[PDB]
Amino acid sequence: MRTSLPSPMFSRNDFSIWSILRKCIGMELSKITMPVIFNEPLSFLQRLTEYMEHTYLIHKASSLSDPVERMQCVAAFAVSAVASQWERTGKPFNPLLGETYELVRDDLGFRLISEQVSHHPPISAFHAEGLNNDFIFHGSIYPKLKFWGKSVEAEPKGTITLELLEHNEAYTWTNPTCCVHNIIVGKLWIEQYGNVEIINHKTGDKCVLNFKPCGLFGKELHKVEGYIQDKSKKKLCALYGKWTECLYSVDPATFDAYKKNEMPVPDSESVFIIPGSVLLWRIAPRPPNSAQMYNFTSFAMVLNEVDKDMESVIPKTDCRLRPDIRAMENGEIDQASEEKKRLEEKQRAARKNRSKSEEDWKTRWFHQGPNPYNGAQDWIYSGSYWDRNYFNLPDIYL
Amino acid sequence: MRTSLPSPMFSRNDFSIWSILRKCIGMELSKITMPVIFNEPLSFLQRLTEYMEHTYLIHKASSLSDPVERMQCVAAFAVSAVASQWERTGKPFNPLLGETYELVRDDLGFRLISEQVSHHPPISAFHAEGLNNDFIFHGSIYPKLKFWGKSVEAEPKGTITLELLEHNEAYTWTNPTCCVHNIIVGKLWIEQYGNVEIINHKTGDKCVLNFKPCGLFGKELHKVEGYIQDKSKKKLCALYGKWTECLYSVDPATFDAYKKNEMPVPDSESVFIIPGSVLLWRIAPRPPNSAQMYNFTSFAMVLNEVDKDMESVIPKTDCRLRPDIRAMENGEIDQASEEKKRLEEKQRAARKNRSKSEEDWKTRWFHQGPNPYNGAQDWIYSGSYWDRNYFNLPDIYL
Ligand SMILES: CC(C)CCC[C@@H](C)[C@H]1CC[C@H]2[C@@H]3CC=C4C[C@@H](O)CC[C@]4(C)[C@H]3CC[C@]12C
Ligand SMILES: CC(C)CCC[C@@H](C)[C@H]1CC[C@H]2[C@@H]3CC=C4C[C@@H](O)CC[C@]4(C)[C@H]3CC[C@]12C
């Protein structure tokens, strides 16, 4: 009768249920495919393209001669870029290595190209341009996940850069942390909080934006408060609002005068417009079909539209061609699950094939390089994507 | 430009991360395979066979003429049956529908047969017999999972029945709830708590066993306290101990006299033997290779041993023949993952094949019927398994 096992056990070190959930919920490679019922029919690259919904704020900024007024607009845009998150608790599809997404919005005067440049760590790079060459807006996002209590925090790591070309100025910042409450059981809902600093690298103007956490009682749900100061640290403007609604500007004096007087969703009031304030930005109302369509904005509903004409110009990596997202969008959930499993296995096989073949992954449209304004490691658009002439691109779809 | 999606979203109702985890951690069918690194190399059927480790308590009970002394032994056995759980935080493999497991321990004087009789809900039935026909011990277990805070509770649902055949008496009870703390992140550890009532259906004797929860401070970790009373509700014996260590008996008077005077594991003291107590049961010390071998008992190390002679008698459904458990036991984790995925897909295909074919699943060795002593719905051993002569058994392994 045996008195022992023929081999000792394997030491799993720190690996936990959280480890599995982290890879699954986040954008890391995961051996377990996230079930399609938790998805929304967008790639993560398309989800990030929603940064561009209020690009009119950038065109407005470019048209103004006063740098402090420009900073108001850039602060408005920074807040507007993250504003569409409320109730977007569907997970966008984990992009495949080498997946790309492009968007041309003639009516909004920009185009954008994005690529999934890595899974170690998962980084999504993007590069947007004003069609009349008034701006460049780029960055890259690695969503770093932590688990607290009943919640997951996604920290969007990477530098955000806005170049107003007519003024020879760049602005940089980082985005606030995004919080997903009730991640295991209960009603999913979303918070954003954190301290954002926008730096004008030509003038030394700085904008401080505090995305307030809830606070006990929840009085501060979604609140944004901050100010613009000049190179001398003199406060020039007070900015206040809610990232889910609006951003306003007011004289710092006037603001301080007025200022003296299962986790559930707290009741948040649309805050009062301090008299004399200037309106900088208000969110677009969500359309009437939004609640039946993953709580998408009207802007987000356009992201994955494809037509035959589009199919003749976009590269084979564009996620409009990703068949599992297409099937989910059309109401074919079992087809979506089926294709998703296929796509993820094909990508695992190709990675193993690259390992045994000794060859390295080549990102097609971005390269690593220092951010020219703050020195940070960055992913920089390499050019040429919009020339078309696509030669020997990754084969990632079925 | 499209203003809507071509199909409305799908309503997922109450489905959550917990829903996925419940199926995965528990014994339900799950589309997501639990990763082998969370397993221990045993089937759930083998894990339950550890109920039998201290069968000598049943032989002792059978040999005694006083029914109250018999009840002490049966209470000892009931506690002993669940005693091997401490630090067994590896998940036993989810049995396949129609999977079976047998154990003959000549040195311990019993044999046991078990079958996975259903996944809706997941029920594991078992039937053990004294080799000299002094007892029958049977039951069935559906592990019902709930998620509280940082913990999962597995409630082992089903009636437990012990028939002492020489005395024409049966005993029934239910097992305590098993708690897995730090289920998402941190160090996994195990508690059992709940109120167990053992009923002698010939005499009306009743044994009350309280498995105490922790309690704030954790003074009560693993403590068992209870008593035996007769049909007249007169208290006859006090029983006390820890399910991780021992069970003792003492005069109820003497006991009450003495009685006046990330979640971490609390410090628990081996409780003091009240003088005059009688020793009923003590746990076997875990062997020196235990901590390198999934914290198995010596008893558990025998469960999955197979030899060529065994392979000529056991049916093709015996989980000694299950290749993924075999591969994990041998240190072949990637082979184990590979075979596990295969086995689970083969079982999903066969279920779909049974659906389109209109035909129903037939359990081979148990049938449904009322428990003869309490009326509850039960799974009853049908006989004939030990005749061998296996004809047209399920084909469930690769
Ligand atoms: C599986 C289910 C339960 C979890 C769903 C998690 C979703 C809601 C999480 C996972 C990744 C998260 C994103 C990570 C990065 C960013 C960029 C940031 O600037 C805005 C928020 C945004 C876009 C997050 C929104 C919420 C997000 C999409
Ligand atoms: C995936 C990891 C993190 C979770 C591991 C869960 C394990 C430890 C759980 C899942 C099912 C549980 C079992 C369910 C039923 C019983 C019968 C009961 O009378 C004794 C405890 C016992 C045997 C439980 C022990 C712990 C158990 C095996």
Numbering used by the authors:
A (entry chain A), B (entry chain A): 533 to 793, 815 to 951
Task: Please give the exact wording used by the authors of the publication that reports this structure.
Members of the OSBP/ORP family vary in length: the short ORPs contain primarily a conserved OSBP-related domain (ORD) that can bind and transfer lipids such as sterols, PIPs or phosphatidylserine (PS), whereas the long ones often possess additional functional domains for ligand binding and/or membrane targeting. The OSBPL1A gene (homo sapiens) encodes two proteins: the long isoform ORP1L (residues 1–950) containing the ANK (ankyrin repeat) domain, the PH (Pleckstrin homology) domain, the FFAT (diphenylalanine in an acidic tract) motif and the ORD, and a short isoform ORP1S (residues 514–950) containing only the ORD. Here, while we cannot rule out its cholesterol sensor function, our structural, biochemical and cell biological data suggest that ORP1L is a bona fide cholesterol transporter. Here, our results suggest that ORP1 is a unique sensor of lysosomal PI-bisphosphates, and that PI(4,5)P2/PI(3,4)P2 allosterically regulates cholesterol transport by ORP1.
To further illustrate the mechanisms underlying cholesterol transport by ORP1-ORD, we solved two crystal structures of ORP1-ORD (524–950 or 534–950) in complex with cholesterol. The most striking feature is that their N-terminal loops (residues 514–546) and lid regions (547–565) adopt different open conformations, distinct from the closed conformations observed in yeast Osh structures. Therefore, the open conformations of ORP1-ORD may represent certain important states when ORP1 exerts physiological functions (see below). The 2Fo-Fc map revealed continuous electron density for cholesterol, which binds deeply into the central tunnel in the core. In the 2.6 Å structure, the 3-hydroxyl group of cholesterol forms direct or water-mediated hydrogen bonds with Tyr583 and Gln724 at the bottom of the binding tunnel. The rigid, fused four-ring backbone and the hydrocarbon tail tightly bind to multiple hydrophobic residues at the tunnel wall. The hydrocarbon tail of cholesterol also forms hydrophobic contacts with Ile557 and Met559 in the lid region, as well as Ile549 from the lid of a symmetry-related molecule. We thus constructed a model of ORP1-ORD monomer based on the 2.6 Å cholesterol-bound structure and performed molecular dynamics (MD) simulation. Significantly, the lid moves toward the tunnel entrance within 20 ns, and the monomeric ORP1-ORD conformations throughout the remaining simulation are similar to the crystal structures of closed Osh proteins.
